[PDB]
């Protein structure tokens, strides 16, 4: 229920991944179609799309006869470009990654954790290991420092270059050195677990894995305000107007407030989103 971030407890099957939602939608009894966002953005017909063999899905989708649409597995957003699909009266709900239009019919869902089962990707297999996240979350949370910073600036520099430039040299920041390996993943999670805060700026897409990775480890992610994030304001996320003038005093106060407040942490659990889709069946 409504509870404190510190009180969060996870089971092995709780973690949100887009594969779990995609798999959920394969059972057509639940009356929901999952399409990779690319096939919406680059549609060759206004109201007809297909996964074109993505996840071995060759079905042609007729959106005029689709009651619930679900899009993800893409850093692409849902924006004004898709307004003609959104205005279809037969569509009761559009569940999407990267909601970027202020329309009440479009419902954000968390990017969550990397899809471990991405076929020939060793990187997806390593970072997608939710067991390792679960294991670390059950160890004693021993705070080593205020904020964890482990950021590849390339993914979206206008924000990420400022974070590295402004805060790399702060005593209250620990710089993380990402090693893409089974040992490296464990070390990364342990580091992040031992901080009150993690920097979770947007990347190529608005939503990032770091945001969700942080919340499962009961570490507070820091994220720039965006319409894409506006339905997650009942999660203990530190939303910032910009990246300038973060201090030890500012973060210590935000820590005391966020940890004192009660949050809808059920939204971190895949079951929430299964039931939310079933609600529009
Ligand atoms: Ca301000
Ligand atoms: Ca500021
Ligand atoms: Mg649980
Ligand atoms: Mg899981
Ligand atoms: Mg992109
Ligand atoms: Mg509009
Ligand atoms: Mg590290
Ligand atoms: Mg800024």
TrEMBL record:
Binding site for Mg(2+) 1: 37, 74, 76
Residues reported in the UniProt entry to bind Mg(2+) 6: 224
Binding site for Mg(2+) 4: 100
Binding-site list for Mg(2+) 7: 227
Binding-site residues for Ca(2+) 1, renumbered to this chain: 242, 244
Keywords tagged on the record: Calcium, Metal-binding
Positions of Mg(2+) 8 binding: 247
MF-aspect GO terms: metal ion binding
Binding site for Mg(2+) 3: 97
Record-listed UDP-alpha-D-xylose binding positions: 75, 150, 152, 155, 160, 179, 185, 188, 205, 208-210, 213
Name of the protein described by the UniProt record: Exostosin GT47 domain-containing protein
Gene name of this polypeptide: A075L
